[PDB]
Design a binder for these strands. Structure first.
Ligand SMILES: Nc1ncnc2c1ncn2[C@@H]1O[C@H](CSCC[C@H](N)C(=O)O)[C@@H](O)[C@H]1O
Lengths: 76, 321, 107, 84, 98, 93, 84, 98, 107, 93
DNA sequence: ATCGGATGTATATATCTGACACGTGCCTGGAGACTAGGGAGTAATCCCCTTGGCGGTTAAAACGCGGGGGAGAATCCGTACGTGCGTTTAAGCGGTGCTAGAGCTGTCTACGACCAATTGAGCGGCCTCGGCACCGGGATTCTCGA
DNA sequence: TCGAGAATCCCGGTGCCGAGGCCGCTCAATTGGTCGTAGACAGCTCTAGCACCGCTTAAACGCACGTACGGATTCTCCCCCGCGTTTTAACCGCCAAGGGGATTACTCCCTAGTCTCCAGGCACGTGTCAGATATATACATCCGAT
């Protein structure tokens, strides 16, 4: 199915997803397709701060829907 | 005896003891009543239209009877132009926005009527002039939907400056040391009563005590957008914990500070991603540039703005060749 | 055991293994605490990062994509703090900062 | 065979000292600067070479290597980067 | 009438030429003969690695360049523009070498 | 014979702080000699700081005081910050 | 209670800078020397005291020793004999 | 008519006196208060050993009289005899401190 | 087994035992040869002998029999090579050499 | 506790070279610090010399080269002559 | 002041080239996992010595006033130094050839760390006087207006 | 072309407190062994430094000439020195408080050391691209003519 990834500067990228795979896998594909670090990104949709071990369907975001992208400083 | 003059609109009347208030190097009560009378004069044109009458240079500080005569002239004048206000004639509306020197000496009036002994403030902090935050207001452009907060307000003078001068919904001020926050709650109450005395408009604001790195304050600064600090001597750990606190701010949030958290020649690259310099644009102002009392050369209070687009174009510029 | 290098635990790029070996086999003191070579390699990696950043800026300002020694001298003699740390040193093939005294230019 | 050098301090030419002073930011050069600078350079090279030759006499060598000159200059304060 | 530049601008073009460039401004082989002549007084029939001659050259000419900077500051301080041997002697006395 | 150097590490910090540029061999050996020289300065000051207090160790604190003495001002503050950041990232591993 | 000295550099008075300059052998001292020498002495004391306080605060002490000032001067290349 | 030395020879008599003696020149308590005022900025509530401010005073007078020797050589070099702030700044710019 | 000291074996005065202990405990190298502290205490004794001889001459010229620090300063500044060795140091309560520049004496 | 010094050895060399002259306590401490500073310079140059050749020992050769490097000219000649005389007077006995 | 002629330097493009950049075995140095010992953290306690506060004395600092002498400014002179130019010269490049010496390796012996037992050198502490600090006043040597 | 006020020096006189010699008492230097290993030395290799040649040509030398500039001169104002009166803070001496340095005892964690594994980095080899060089022509500018 389809996903929208909204950036906070006003851009979206449309991507090929499976809801059965984890969101860590699609954020790895976000790394391979844009270069955003896995530690640095965080994706939220309607007050729902995602976790990497969970999948897309586990937080109930459907087809042709958008995840909002915001960044945090990585640290160690 | 006593000395009283009521508001030009008719609030609770301004009271003064017949004993002399002497406070500081430059702040006396005679100059206080002189500057307050002159700014009440400059606020309404009819007042200096009516009271040009025959009072020249011959008046001195301790000679109290000429002060009584002049203030009795002003009291008769206040009652009489109130009777001129009682007719069909419209006055100047109370809910208008004030001037700049008006707020300057209204803040110096709160400085007078609340703090008497400033060197007890030495028990350790310095003074922030109002022309600094005035040229900041010349630089910063703001709305109603954002929130103003200064962190480490001291006596809280700039809190009252922003709360009476411009229009955030909720202005905060914080102070952790016992003596300037101790004086600052009284400054809050007396500034409330002096805003009743002058009758000029001012929005919702508070003066609080606490450590602004606490767990409530973390999401509290993560709520607001407009922040002022004087971070010359906060220390390293305070500023770094505040950096990882301001990382959770929304778009367009603005910081004004003395020691800049990121130097203005910043370029982001794959080593310093953890720093807050990836988030902020840094611009420089031009204040009066003084403060020759301690160390101060010509230095500006640099403005940071949360700009998360430079990080985005760096991440997309990662795949150029 | 899966061998994870001690520079990779700290996230430094400079080695702390080699810094630890030099601190031991240089005779600075008898014992070398384990928290010291990671600290020292962080400081060396930071100073290399600052001189390389200013050198890359001075090389890209000269429209070259390669750091020549002249770009290193143009880096460390312009920043006043690196000029204070590297005050005594001669960088070979380094050149001089172009600064002529304003007395010599004619009115 | 062998060779024995009489004086080569006149080999540091007048255009060489002119070029060195032009690097320093000197506009006019008096005519005695050439003799004084040959003297100054001879004193400086005597110091660096005396320390370098001691560093290479210690190691039972007969080649003043570049590390010996770099260590001599590191001893006198003039640390030299770019030779090891 | 030939094209002649006012005395004092080929000096400034020379300054802007050599200050922006990184050559070794003394010629190499006279410096090799100077270094071998000076080194014959300390240890007879020595040899020199070529990198050591280049190290002695880069060090000696960078010292002479810094000395001419201090000398030019001395001469400008004396309200002149021409470095003179009393200016070099003053700069080496202030620096702590005589 | 393996003559070790800081070639590859200065190269990695270059490819971090400047993803385009590279470094010529003369400037490579200049940064080699610079890393060796700042190492000998900080280790010398740490050795004297260990001997002046009648200790026998170069712990992290002696390298921190050596960096506070040698590097001037803002380099001291930044290098102290980056050092203690790396040592606290190292100890929690 | 507590105290802080507001501007205490004028204890290096004009006859003190005059006496120091007469020790070095100057014959006549311009009147603008004294502000410059107070600034120079303030920078020198700031450097020596900064290194001395760092040598102390390393050792977990609150008294700047005479050994700490001697080491702070030996660090800058101004070795001081007489205090250890 | 009172007896008055010409301007210049009380200076030379002071030079001979302060050069032939070895006592300290700055008064000891102003220098101690200046050392405490400068050490206020680095760590607060610092105590000083009495020999520590004595060592700071020996070092500061030795530094200042060496700087005044250098600035006297600069002022003599400019064909003057009065030291001036140009001279002190030149000596410090040559010795490598500014 | 008569305990004949190494300071007396070489005809020196300086404590070759103490110099050996300082060379070992001071962390200069991982081992210190037996030829080291005899040589080093000889050099220290010679430099102390030259400084004390010149200071004794400078105190005898001032008709005093105690070497105070001013005589040490006159000793290390009047000689050329001790002034080159001690060029950085500031011998406390030592004063300077008495000399006025030739442009300042009246004419 | 016991704070060691070179006081009595400087006193013995003074009694050798000037049998009637004494040394005040401040000049005693100055000669103490002078002996300590010259010992630290010669041992520092000897440690650097013994490390620069990848040796491990401060022999008499290294102290001789360090004294030849630090002391200028005639002091170096007289000091290495005194040192080699004392090391031969030591090793013969 | 304005304005071209000649010059110099910068800007653009095509060329070679060699020095940088990256992939390959490989080997040795770094990581790891115990092991033991002592070095260092921590607490407690003694006591030196450092800060802070009296007052009395007075030498030194501050202020102010003539006034001479020195810094600086303006002018003038001539000469020493920059600038071209042509004439000399020797540096640089590019090869070849040698052997001297750096450098690596392979034994091996003297030598120095290490440790235990022994003792006197050198330490702190304490009398003890004498070299020098202070002092008083007179002779000597200036410095200057005569 | 010197006498007179005045510092400076010198010389005898007094007092003190720091050098200087003496004395128990540790504990660090000495001696006597043992053993591991580092350095000395022999020998072989093979880089590389010295030496030499000739060609090219960039550069150095010499030289005359003109001009800016360094140096001497004279003058002029101000400013810094010397001196005298006031004034003030240093300084000395003494006083107590108590903070923190210095020392000791204890205990355990951290690091040298060692043995084993393995991958990080280094010498080496090779492609190819950034830069150097050469050329060809636009801009910056310098300077004398009007
Ligand atoms: N944790 C904390 N919470 C609140 N105030 C703090 C703080 N740490 C320091 N501060 C205060 O920061 C102040 C710095 S002075 C700033 C003066 C005042 N904000 C003005 O602009 O006029 C001091 O009063 C100090 O007490």
């Amino acid at each position: 199915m389809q996903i929208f990834v909204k950036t906070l500067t006003g851009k979206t990228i449309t991507l090929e997803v499976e809801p059965s795979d984890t969101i860590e896998n699609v954020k790895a594909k976000i790394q391979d397709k844009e270069g955003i670090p896995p530690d640095q990104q965080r994706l939220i949709f309607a007050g729902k701060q995602l976790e990497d071990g969970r999948t897309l369907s586990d937080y109930n975001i459907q087809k042709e829907s958008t995840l909002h992208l915001v960044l945090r400083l990585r640290g160690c | 005896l006593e000395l009283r003059l009521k508001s030009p609109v008719g609030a609770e009347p301004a009271v003064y003891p017949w004993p002399l208030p002497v406070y500081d190097k430059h702040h006396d009560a005679a100059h206080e009543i002189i500057e307050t009378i002159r700014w009440v004069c400059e606020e309404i044109p009819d007042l200096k239209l009516a009271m040009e009458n025959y009072v020249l240079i011959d008046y001195d500080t301790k000679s109290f009877e000429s002060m009584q005569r002049l203030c009795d002239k002003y009291n008769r004048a206040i009652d009489s132009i109130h009777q001129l206000w009682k007719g069909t004639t419209q006055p100047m509306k109370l809910n208008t926005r004030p001037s700049t020197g008006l707020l300057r000496h209204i803040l110096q009036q709160v400085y007078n009527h609340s703090v008497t002994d400033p060197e007890k403030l030495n028990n350790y902090y310095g003074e922030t002039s109002f022309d600094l935050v005035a040229q900041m207001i010349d630089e910063i452009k703001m709305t109603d939907d954002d929130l103003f907060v200064d962190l480490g307000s001291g006596v809280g003078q700039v809190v009252l400056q922003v709360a009476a001068a411009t229009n955030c919904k909720h202005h905060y001020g914080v102070e952790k040391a016992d003596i300037p926050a101790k004086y600052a709650e009284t400054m809050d109450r007396e500034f409330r009563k002096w805003m009743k005395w002058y009758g000029k408009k001012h929005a919702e604001y508070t003066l609080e005590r606490g450590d602004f790195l606490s767990e409530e304050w973390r999401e509290r600064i993560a709520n607001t957008s407009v922040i002022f600090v004087n971070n010359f001597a906060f220390g390293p750990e305070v500023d770094h914990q505040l950096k990882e606190r301001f990382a959770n701010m929304k778009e367009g949030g603005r910081i004004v500070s003395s020691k800049p958290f990121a130097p203005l020649n910043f370029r982001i690259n794959s080593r310093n991603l953890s720093d807050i310099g990836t988030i902020m644009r840094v611009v420089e102002l031009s204040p009066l540039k003084g403060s020759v009392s301690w160390t101060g050369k010509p230095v500006s209070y640099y403005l940071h703005t949360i700009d998360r687009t430079i990080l985005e174009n760096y991440f997309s510029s990662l795949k150029n060749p | 055991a899966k061998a994870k290098t001690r520079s990779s635990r700290a996230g430094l790029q400079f080695p702390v293994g080699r810094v630890h070996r030099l601190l031991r086999k240089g005779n600075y003191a008898e014992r070398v605490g384990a928290g010291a070579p990671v600290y020292l390699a962080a400081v060396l990696e930071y100073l290399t990062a600052e001189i390389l950043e200013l050198a890359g800026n001075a090389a890209r300002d000269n429209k070259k994509t390669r750091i020549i020694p002249r770009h290193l001298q143009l880096a460390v003699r312009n920043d006043e703090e690196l000029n204070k740390l590297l005050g005594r040193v001669t960088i070979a093939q380094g050149g001089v900062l172009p600064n002529i005294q304003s007395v010599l230019l004619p009115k | 065979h062998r060779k024995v050098l009489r004086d080569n301090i006149q080999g540091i030419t007048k255009p060489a000292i002119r070029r060195l002073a032009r690097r320093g930011g000197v506009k006019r050069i008096s005519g005695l600067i050439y003799e004084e600078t040959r003297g100054v350079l001879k004193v400086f090279l005597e110091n660096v070479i005396r320390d370098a030759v001691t560093y290479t006499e210690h190691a039972k060598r007969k080649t003043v290597t570049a590390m010996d000159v770099v260590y001599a200059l590191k001893r006198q304060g003039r640390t030299l980067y770019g030779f090891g | 009438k030939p094209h002649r530049y006012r005395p004092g601008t080929v000096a400034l073009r020379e300054i802007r030429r050599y200050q922006k460039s990184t050559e070794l401004l003394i010629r190499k082989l006279p410096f090799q003969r100077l270094v071998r002549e000076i080194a014959q007084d300390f240890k007879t029939d020595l040899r020199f690695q070529s990198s050591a001659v280049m190290a002695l050259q880069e060090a000696s000419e960078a010292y002479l360049v810094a000395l001419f900077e201090d000398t030019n500051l001395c001469a400008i301080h004396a309200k002149r523009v021409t470095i003179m041997p009393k200016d070099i002697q003053l700069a080496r006395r202030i620096r702590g070498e005589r | 014979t393996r003559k070790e150097s800081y070639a590859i590490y200065v190269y990695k910090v270059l490819k971090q702080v400047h993803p385009d540029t590279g470094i010529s061999s003369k400037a490579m050996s200049i940064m080699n000699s610079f890393v060796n020289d700042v190492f000998e300065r900080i280790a010398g000051e740490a050795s004297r700081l260990a001997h002046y207090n009648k200790r026998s160790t170069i712990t992290s604190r002696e390298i921190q005081t050596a960096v506070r003495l040698l590097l001037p001002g803002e380099l001291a503050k930044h290098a102290v910050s980056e050092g203690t950041k790396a040592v606290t990232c190292y100890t929690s591993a």
